[PDB]
Amino acid sequence: ANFNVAHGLAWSYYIGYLRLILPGLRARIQAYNQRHKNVLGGIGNHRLHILFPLDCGVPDDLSVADPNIRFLHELPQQGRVYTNSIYELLENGQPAGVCVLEYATPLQTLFAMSQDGRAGFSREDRLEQAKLFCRTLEDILADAPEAQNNCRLIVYQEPTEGGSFSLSQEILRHLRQEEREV
Amino acid sequence: ANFNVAHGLAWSYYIGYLRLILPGLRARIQAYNQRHKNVLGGIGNHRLHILFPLDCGVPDDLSVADPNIRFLHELPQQSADRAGIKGRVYTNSIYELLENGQPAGVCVLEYATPLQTLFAMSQDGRAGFSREDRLEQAKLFCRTLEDILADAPEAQNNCRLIVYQEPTEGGSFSLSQEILRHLRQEE
Numbered sequence A: 001a002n003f004n005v006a007h008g009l010a011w012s013y014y015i016g017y018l019r020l021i022l023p024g025l026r027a028r029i030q031a032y033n034q035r036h037k038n039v040l041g042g043i044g045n046h047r048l049h050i051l052f053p054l055d056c057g058v059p060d061d062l063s064v065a066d067p068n069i070r071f072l073h074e075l076p077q078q079g080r081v082y083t084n085s086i087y088e089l090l091e092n093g094q095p096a097g098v099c100v101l102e103y104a105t106p107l108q109t110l111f112a113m114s115q116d117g118r119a120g121f122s123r124e125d126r127l128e129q130a131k132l133f134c135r136t137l138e139d140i141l142a143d144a145p146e147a148q149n150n151c152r153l154i155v156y157q158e159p160t161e162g163g164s165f166s167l168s169q170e171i172l173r174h175l176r177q178e179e180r181e182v
Numbered sequence B: 001a002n003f004n005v006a007h008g009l010a011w012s013y014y015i016g017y018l019r020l021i022l023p024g025l026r027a028r029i030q031a032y033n034q035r036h037k038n039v040l041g042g043i044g045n046h047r048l049h050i051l052f053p054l055d056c057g058v059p060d061d062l063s064v065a066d067p068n069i070r071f072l073h074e075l076p077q078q079s080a081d082r083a084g085i086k087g088r089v090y091t092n093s094i095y096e097l098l099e100n101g102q103p104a105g106v107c108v109l110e111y112a113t114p115l116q117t118l119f120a121m122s123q124d125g126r127a128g129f130s131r132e133d134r135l136e137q138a139k140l141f142c143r144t145l146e147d148i149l150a151d152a153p154e155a156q157n158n159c160r161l162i163v164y165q166e167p168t169e170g171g172s173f174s175l176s177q178e179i180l181r182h183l184r185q186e187e
């Protein structure tokens, strides 16, 4: 079995998803702000933030396990449906940020492959595939400049949940980086 | 520009879709029948039928592809929290297959979506990915996925892969007939 999947994962994720949703994301965020203007407040950061745990451990629990990352509200679409997610970030127990946030789902493909009990695909093979996946997507996004102005990758080595690594602080650092550039 | 994507497409389609959708499919079909069999009619075949056109872009819609394929009804949706998305929707449709202007078959039917990904890749103006490349990647995608399913017996028993060529001078191939032949063999 050939386990060189990273190129397929990167082009699939770009062609089948990021290429399709990134052009209209800003307008959907702006619409949401306007719909909820006097009530729910405004999301100022208009980029999709894509979490990329190199260990490929991607949770499906909407981060309820991490009390400093909380699901706020769906970002509605615009019968296969493409919606996104607004999350609140907390710091020292207090609200600290709000952004459109999600995980790179194809990392879960890499995880299952290393966890499925087949022979030639270890945790070590997985990490090299995750890195190649990451690098290929970045190279792709680096030639689709309308997409990379709408999208930021948050790449990190630690477990997304558990231990002393704070994913919330990591995201917040990226939000402040982006705030600086605009 | 490295466009060897087929192996990744197959693993992605298996883990990210087939492994997730097939275990609950029979229960959704049973719910469909419980709600509709006494009026609209029920479905006897409980398997997902997945179409793999090797040498033509996946049509935008199955009735456009063949006038003898008619949309019947959607199954109850499958909703799930997925990688930060609340209630991501996975949906499947039942179609009627017509023969001599009469429904002759009914089943849960869809195209293999990675073949749409390959088609899109071939139409984006990028150099080094011709229709020839697309066709080779489509066959390798199909082969690898069947390779994977051969070690996944429950998944193999819950879906049927309908793999076919299509003539590009046309007229000598009916897609409904091709699906009907498979349905009649399953029984």
Ligand SMILES: Nc1nc2c(ncn2[C@@H]2O[C@@H]3COP(=O)(O)O[C@H]4[C@@H](O)[C@H](n5cnc6c(=O)[nH]c(N)nc65)O[C@@H]4COP(=O)(O)O[C@H]3[C@H]2O)c(=O)[nH]1
Residues within 6 Å of the ligand: A012, A013, A015, A016, A017, A018, A080, A081, A082, A083, A084, A104, A105, A106, A109, B012, B013, B014, B015, B016, B017, B085, B088, B089, B090, B091, B110, B111, B113, B114, B117
């Ligand atoms: N929030 C959100 N993200 C999305 C949606 N669709 C695609 N993506 C993202 O883009 C990746 C690639 O999509 P793909 O090219 O269609 O490639 C997909 C596709 O070929 C198949 N697949 C996934 N979902 C569906 C589905 O609802 N229906 C069908 N027929 N196939 C699906 O499995 C492949 C891998 O799926 P994933 O592992 O999930 O990985 C997906 C996922 O990360 C969506 O509707 N909502």
